[PDB]
Design brief:
Chain A: This is Nucleoid occlusion factor SlmA. Chain A: Its main location: cytoplasm. Two copies of one chain form a homodimer. The first copy, chain A, has 190 residues and is mainly alpha-helical. Chain A has a single domain, classed as Tetracycline Repressor, domain 2. Chain A has ten helices and no strands. In chain A, α1 crosses α2, α4 packs parallel to α7 and α5 packs across α6. The radius of gyration of chain A is 18 Å and the shape is elongated. The termini of chain A are far apart. The interface between A and B is large, with 38 and 38 residues.
Chain lengths: 190, 162
């Protein structure tokens, strides 16, 4: 219920703390919300389910935000800019959810969790190639380079920004100087 | 030599299963290997652009040939005791980035025309490229080789440098 949400947010926070270089315990978490260790399981069968709900929140957020973009912008280049900004801003506002995107927070959790993350990225990348291909349908003159290279190139930029954000201890924010960086990234597109 | 790498890269994967000390000595080796290699590059190529190319190839190739050592550069391997170790790795990237910036700054004196953009931005752009590739190499379980299609990717990354 309402308590369910309040439990996930506490975890995302702990995931961004030193806990991530460690291991979140059902004990350390039930008190955060105040409820009993047992009452915690009334909303979550296990700690793994909590991660899933977090991963699921992540995919819903990204996927849904991307869909909106494609309806507010008809331009290919502008759509690409927004998708990257979207992934960088999301990370920045959710330092804990980023440690999952980067895998660091899944090291001592069900390796199956990394799988979901890996599938999510492929999903992102696939959406990115789909967008770039349409440039020929929208602008006639499309990209003279394979969309698979371009899309991966872009997602690598995003992942590299998130990775630098995590290791630096959230010091180097993903969006800092984004608009100054984007033109350099767009220069890679053809 | 390269043999002193396969052995240590093999050591890193083994310890993930004092340990802190070793990982520290390993972070030292990684630095010593990367720094030395970059210096040698600056002696075989005078061209700024080509120098930037070789330095990125170096980082990518090193990681690719040492999956266990990349796990350290990406921090994943330091996720069990962590803390200070990740900090030393951070200092490693700061050293690489700095080197990257110094190289970039020499374009004006060497070729005449420099960059219209701040070297701090460009350097962090190339290093972000490398960290993205490396990180995707780890989460893919070493399937996405960091250098795959490098020569096709490099002209694009170079397009960001004026």
């Amino acid at each position: 219920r309402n308590r369910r949400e309040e439990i996930l947010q506490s975890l995302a926070l702990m995931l961004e703390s030193s806990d991530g270089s460690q291991r979140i315990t059902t004990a350390k978490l039930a008190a955060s919300v105040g409820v009993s260790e047992a009452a915690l399981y009334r909303h979550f069968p296990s700690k793994t389910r909590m991660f899933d709900s977090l991963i699921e929140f992540i995919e819903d957020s990204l996927i849904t935000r991307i869909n909106l973009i494609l309806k507010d912008e008809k331009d290919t280049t502008a759509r690409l800019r927004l998708i990257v900004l979207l992934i960088l801003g999301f990370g920045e506002r959710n330092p804990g959810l980023t440690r999952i995107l980067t895998g660091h927070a899944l090291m001592f959790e069900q390796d199956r969790l990394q799988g979901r993350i890996n599938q999510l990225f492929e999903r992102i990348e696939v959406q990115l190639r789909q967008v770039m291909r349409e440039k020929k349908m929208r602008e006639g003159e499309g990209y003279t380079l394979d969309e698979t290279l371009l899309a991966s190139q872009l997602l690598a930029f995003c992942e590299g920004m998130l990775s630098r954000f995590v290791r630096s201890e959230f010091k180097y924010r993903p969006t800092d100087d984004f608009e100054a960086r984007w033109p350099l990234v767009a220069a890679q597109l053809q």
